[PDB]
Design a protein around this motif. Structure first.
Motif, PDB file in Angstrom:
ATOM      1  N   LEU A 139       2.349  10.020 -10.019  1.00 58.96           N
ATOM      2  CA  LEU A 139       1.530  10.172 -11.218  1.00 58.96           C
ATOM      3  C   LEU A 139       0.599  11.374 -11.100  1.00 58.96           C
ATOM      4  CD1 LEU A 139       0.532   9.309 -13.937  1.00 58.96           C
ATOM      5  CD2 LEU A 139      -1.038   7.711 -12.825  1.00 58.96           C
ATOM      6  N   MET A 140       0.033  11.592  -9.912  1.00 61.72           N
ATOM      7  CA  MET A 140      -0.871  12.717  -9.704  1.00 61.72           C
ATOM      8  C   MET A 140      -0.145  14.045  -9.859  1.00 61.72           C
ATOM      9  SD  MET A 140      -3.822  12.772  -6.782  1.00 61.72           S
ATOM     10  CE  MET A 140      -2.541  12.124  -5.715  1.00 61.72           C
ATOM     11  N   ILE A 148       1.223   6.440  -7.102  1.00 62.24           N
ATOM     12  CA  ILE A 148       0.075   7.218  -7.555  1.00 62.24           C
ATOM     13  C   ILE A 148       0.254   8.691  -7.215  1.00 62.24           C
ATOM     14  CG2 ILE A 148      -2.425   7.389  -7.575  1.00 62.24           C
ATOM     15  CD1 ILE A 148      -2.453   4.482  -6.509  1.00 62.24           C
ATOM     16  N   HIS A 149       0.938   9.007  -6.112  1.00 63.47           N
ATOM     17  CA  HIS A 149       1.230  10.405  -5.807  1.00 63.47           C
ATOM     18  C   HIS A 149       2.129  11.020  -6.872  1.00 63.47           C
ATOM     19  CE1 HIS A 149      -1.054  10.800  -2.310  1.00 63.47           C
ATOM     20  NE2 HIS A 149      -0.179  10.442  -1.389  1.00 63.47           N
ATOM     21  N   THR A 202       2.411   1.663  -3.529  1.00 61.69           N
ATOM     22  CA  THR A 202       1.387   2.070  -4.485  1.00 61.69           C
ATOM     23  C   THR A 202       0.961   3.514  -4.259  1.00 61.69           C
ATOM     24  OG1 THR A 202       0.628  -0.227  -4.514  1.00 61.69           O
ATOM     25  CG2 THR A 202      -0.812   1.429  -5.491  1.00 61.69           C
ATOM     26  N   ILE A 203       0.840   3.930  -2.996  1.00 64.27           N
ATOM     27  CA  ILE A 203       0.482   5.312  -2.697  1.00 64.27           C
ATOM     28  C   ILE A 203       1.549   6.260  -3.221  1.00 64.27           C
ATOM     29  CG2 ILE A 203       0.275   6.965  -0.809  1.00 64.27           C
ATOM     30  CD1 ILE A 203      -2.242   5.285  -1.603  1.00 64.27           C
ATOM     31  N   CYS A 249       0.825  -1.200   0.000  1.00 62.83           N
ATOM     32  CA  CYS A 249       0.000   0.000   0.000  1.00 62.83           C
ATOM     33  C   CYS A 249       0.861   1.253   0.000  1.00 62.83           C
ATOM     34  CB  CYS A 249      -0.937  -0.009   1.208  1.00 62.83           C
ATOM     35  SG  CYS A 249      -2.442  -0.980   0.974  1.00 62.83           S
ATOM     36  N   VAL A 285       0.432  14.587 -13.545  1.00 61.71           N
ATOM     37  CA  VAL A 285      -0.806  14.961 -14.224  1.00 61.71           C
ATOM     38  C   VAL A 285      -1.155  16.414 -13.937  1.00 61.71           C
ATOM     39  CG1 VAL A 285      -3.301  14.646 -14.075  1.00 61.71           C
ATOM     40  CG2 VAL A 285      -1.824  12.687 -14.549  1.00 61.71           C
ATOM     41  N   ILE A 286      -0.988  16.840 -12.684  1.00 64.52           N
ATOM     42  CA  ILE A 286      -1.305  18.216 -12.313  1.00 64.52           C
ATOM     43  C   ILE A 286      -0.381  19.190 -13.034  1.00 64.52           C
ATOM     44  CG2 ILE A 286      -0.775  19.772 -10.401  1.00 64.52           C
ATOM     45  CD1 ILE A 286      -2.607  18.113  -8.672  1.00 64.52           C
TER      46      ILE A 286
END
Lengths: 404, 57, 135, 172
Positions: free
Chosen positions: C120-121, C117-118, C113-114, C110, C124-125
């Protein structure tokens, strides 16, 4: 005289609660309940009707001796009206006679060989009985038989694309026969629509039910399971370790022709497959699965052609029609074209030299469509875990799971 | 499974085959995920049927 | 507690090492030395108060250029690959045990993965803010 | 695109009936629509479903089933010959042109995808006319062509919420 008193009792008892005594009287019978009731049933229930109408219909259908005179069709119409005006959650308090009434209606339709009129009845019958859309009821196996005896497969699709999660106890009854019949007829329906990846799953679920004796319905769910596994995959899949021991000790020796068919369909040789099909045609035609073996015979050629693509990059058609034994370059060309049209293979035909060239470049993993697919898998997994957590929370609060 | 190569019969040439690691990784992961979902639904149906005492008497 | 100043300065990460020791008698890798049996290692963790957190975040706030130009997950690739390898080893150990550690493996997965994804976020931003202006 | 509404309307018209058997025109229209959508299994089971008496009452169903049998064997040239062999009522009239257009598009896609070089005779039989569609192919879409052997060479042709949902699910 007494009939009017009973009717008044049910009328005054309903609409004010006191459900327990009500269901207590419904099943009290009354020694045929003075079967000349008939007409007064019309005044017994209006608008929302009542619950006693279900009992009247059940006792009318329970004699099983030419139930409701040659005018039975008219009563059929009344039953349809009932299905469209039952409503309410009160019918869920009597999930023992509704299933019997539906089964009797379907049996009557089957013995008159008109299994199309009652198709629409067992959609609202199911929709107004299950607590949620993920609950297996005894009528599912009945609709799956009504829509299978008469060729109409699409209406049953909405009830076969859902994953059963709980089984209604139906306050009794509901033997394993209904569960097995549902999971066998659904498998046959999926096989008929050429959806093998789920027909195999349905047959596998049907086979691994716990059992202690040989049943008539598990035989024609392992026999067809072998053929479906031979069509979809290149081998007969091994049953999971939790399979019931009856299939591995008594069922297997009883039907050994299909095991020999798989043994022939273990080494690539179409001639031996055709010879064994011819030799054992009586067994394959007595079980009525004729047509599902020709599909295996045809799929052998496709499997060989697909295996050819793991070694060759460009193959002459004349040379190609010498390992798969298709006896002709034109037939090989048409087979390859048919396989390409279905997306099973990635190949191109060059008619100048008569050569088939294999590409094997399906997709690079940068297209946003694959991102959408991954997102869909994410959503499915998240929903599955949510249902798991919801199921577990009920167990954690169970009054039984605090004593140990 | 000893030689990773492809035969071209037009020119009679044996070409070497290079495996795209990313593509096979993604394919294997997707296949494993689909298999796991199928197994999970199967076992959940089993748990549904083993709690109502269904044993084909 | 043992730290390495020179290696901390050169590499960029601290060399904090907290050690307790097994007492004499209890008998039951060249980096650790030659007395690896006598002494063992411990995990390290940190904390800070609410006031300390607010002050540190407000002081680090004067780092906006590096904040929105760091583009993480491209600098810590080796760390993430090592974390995934250790995840595989822990998963194998948990599977052997099942024949608990599963909870620890789940928490580690977890966390990784967190972090992914952080990253990737943030990417993206940044793409939304910079690359979607003036056509 | 308008045919889907007619399709499901015919579906619920079929689902229930006063005696389980509907009129010949609706049966024929439903079978033709099944043939059009390139869904062969449902059309075949519908043909099996029709009682023999009403099946032999009208010959329109016979022609529809002949077209379905021709398209089931994937024999492209015979489809165009068997689709116009007989006469079609107005109720099934706008089905034939749509089916022919869909078959032509499917043949075009199959030729462009599964072939790198095909004899002009076979391609022209696939498409429908060996006079002017070859020059149309070479000129309009630039397909290479060569005479003598008559060879053509067709060529093949809202975000942050999901991430935060994934993070929330993982952290919990």
């Amino acid at each position: 005289s007494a009939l009017e008193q009973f009717v008044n009792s049910v009328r005054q008892l309903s609409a004010q609660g006191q459900m327990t005594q009500l269901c207590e009287l419904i099943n009290k019978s009354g020694e045929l309940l003075a079967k000349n009731l008939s007409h007064l049933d019309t005044v017994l229930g209006a608008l929302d009707v009542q619950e006693h109408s279900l009992g009247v219909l059940a006792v009318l259908f329970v004699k099983f001796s030419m139930p409701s005179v040659p005018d039975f069709e008219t009563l059929f119409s009344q039953v349809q009206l009932f299905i469209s005006t039952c409503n309410g959650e009160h019918i869920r308090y009597a999930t023992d006679t509704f299933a019997g009434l539906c089964h009797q209606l379907t049996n009557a339709l089957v013995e008159r060989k008109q299994p199309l009129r009652g198709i629409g009845i067992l959609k609202q019958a199911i929709d107004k009985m299950q607590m949620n859309t993920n609950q297996l009821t005894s009528i599912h196996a009945d609709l799956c038989q009504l829509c299978l005896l008469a060729k109409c497969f699409k209406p049953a699709l909405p009830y076969l694309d859902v994953d059963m999660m709980d089984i209604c106890k139906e306050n009794g009854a509901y033997d394993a026969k209904h569960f097995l019949c549902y999971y066998y007829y659904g498998g046959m329906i999926y096989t008929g629509l050429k959806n093998f990846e789920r027909a195999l799953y349905f047959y596998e679920q049907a086979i691994t039910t716990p059992a202690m004796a040989v049943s008539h319905i598990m035989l024609e769910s392992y026999k067809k399971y072998i053929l479906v596994s031979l069509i979809l995959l290149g081998k007969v899949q091994q049953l999971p370790k939790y399979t019931s021991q009856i299939v591995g000790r008594f069922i297997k020796p009883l039907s050994n022709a299909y095991h020999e068919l798989a043994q022939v369909y273990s080494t690539n040789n179409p001639s031996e497959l055709r010879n064994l099909v011819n030799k054992h045609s009586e067994t394959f035609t007595r079980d009525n699965n004729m047509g599902l073996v020709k599909q295996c015979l045809s799929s052998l050629y496709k499997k060989n052609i697909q295996r050819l693509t793991k070694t060759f990059l460009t193959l002459s058609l004349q040379d190609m029609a010498s390992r798969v034994q298709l006896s002709g370059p034109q037939e090989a060309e048409k087979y390859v074209l048919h396989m390409i049209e279905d997306g099973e293979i990635f190949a191109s035909i060059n008619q100048k030299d008569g050569m088939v060239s294999f590409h094997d470049n399906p997709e690079k993993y940068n297209n946003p469509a694959m991102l959408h697919n991954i997102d869909q898998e994410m959503l499915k997994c998240i929903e599955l875990d949510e249902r798991l957590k919801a199921m577990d929370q009920e167990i954690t609060v169970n009054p039984q799971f605090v004593q140990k | 499974g000893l030689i990773s190569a492809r035969v071209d019969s037009h020119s009679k040439i044996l070409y070497a085959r290079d495996v795209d690691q990313r593509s096979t990784t993604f394919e294997k992961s997707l296949l494993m995920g689909k298999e796991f979902q199928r197994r999970a639904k199967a076992m959940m149906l089993r748990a549904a049927v083993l709690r109502n005492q269904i044993h084909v008497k | 507690v043992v730290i390495d100043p020179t290696r901390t300065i050169s590499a960029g990460k601290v060399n904090l090492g907290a050690f307790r020791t097994y007492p004499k008698g209890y008998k039951p890798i060249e980096d650790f030395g030659v007395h690896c049996k006598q002494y063992y290692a411990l995990e390290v963790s940190y904390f800070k108060s609410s006031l300390d957190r607010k002050l540190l975040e407000l002081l680090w706030n004067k780092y906006w250029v590096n904040t929105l130009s760091s583009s993480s997950l491209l600098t810590n690739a080796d760390y993430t690959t090592g974390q995934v390898f250790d995840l595989s080893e822990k998963l194998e150990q948990s599977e052997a045990q099942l024949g608990d550690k599963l909870a620890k493996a789940t928490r580690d997965s977890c966390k990784t993965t967190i972090e992914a994804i952080h990253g990737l976020m943030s990417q993206v931003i940044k793409d939304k803010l910079f690359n979607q202006i003036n056509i | 695109f308008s045919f889907k509404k007619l399709l499901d309307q015919c579906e619920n018209q079929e689902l229930e009936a006063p005696g389980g058997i509907a009129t010949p025109p609706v049966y024929g229209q439903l079978l033709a629509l099944y043939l059009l959508h390139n869904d062969m299994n449902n059309a075949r089971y519908l043909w099996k479903r029709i009682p023999p008496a009403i099946k032999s009452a009208n010959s329109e169903l016979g022609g529809i089933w002949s077209v379905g049998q021709r398209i089931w064997q994937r024999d492209f040239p015979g489809i165009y010959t068997t689709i116009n062999a007989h006469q079609w009522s107005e109720t099934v009239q706008p089905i034939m042109e749509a089916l022919r257009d869909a078959t032509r598009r499917r043949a075009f896609a199959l030729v462009s995808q599964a072939y790198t070089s095909i004899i002009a005779d076979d391609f022209a039989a696939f498409v429908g006319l060996p006079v002017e569609e070859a020059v149309k192919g070479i000129l309009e879409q630039g397909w290479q062509a060569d005479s003598t052997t008559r060879m053509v060479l067709p060529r093949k042709p809202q975000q942050l919420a999901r991430l935060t949902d994934y993070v929330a699910f993982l952290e919990n």
